[PDB]
Amino acid sequence: MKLAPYILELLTSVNRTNGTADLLVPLLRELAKGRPVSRTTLAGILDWPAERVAAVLEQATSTEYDKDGNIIGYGLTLRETSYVFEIDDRRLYAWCALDTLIFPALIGRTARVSSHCAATGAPVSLTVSPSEIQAVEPAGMAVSLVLPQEAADVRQSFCCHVHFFASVPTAEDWASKHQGLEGLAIVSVHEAFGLGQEFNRHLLQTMS
């Protein structure tokens, strides 16, 4: 499957609001330490005015905060989800399957990723490094993709439809019952990883 439409709409979703791409990688690296991240901490890391950080974050409507207004989730999160993203001894989480494949290159770490098949509840796991995936269990693991939508909550529009599956046939069965999803497509986790690599490549270009 040619994945250019997915890559294209994901980059567009990140390059839509100026600065977002430039705040993403530093914030992911900081969240990776496993503690909440203050806006003030972030502003210093980026060397931005606070108002610039705030404007970008306000545009990112799915961003997760704790009781202190600290950032605790943006793709990578401290708040439990179905996608477990373990770096070092530290259990973090991701908003969706494709997140888990993308972040390790962006944060320069190897993650032990685990979840369950969205069609059958079967456990799935794999090791994701900046350059490759290993220990893919089961070997035929698949991922669902949908097309990001322009004026749409990213987590509700994209992330919550982007799952792991035990296999491509299992995933395709599931897919046939959900054709109402825009640009719904099933790919192998290898193809999804490749998609993530093209996204990351392009992202690092658009940064300043």
Curated annotation (Swiss-Prot):
GO molecular function: alkylmercury lyase activity
SUPFAM superfamilies named among the record's database cross-references: NosL/MerB-like (SSF160387), Winged helix' DNA-binding domain (SSF46785)
Reaction catalysis annotation: an alkylmercury + H(+) = an alkane + Hg(2+)
GO biological process, one term: response to mercury ion
Domain of life: Bacteria
Keywords: Lyase, Mercuric resistance, Mercury, Plasmid
Keyword Lyase: yes
Role: Cleaves the carbon-mercury bond of organomercurials such as phenylmercuric acetate. One product is Hg(2+), which is subsequently detoxified by the mercuric reductase.
Family: Belongs to the MerB family.
This protein's name: Alkylmercury lyase
Organism: Escherichia coli
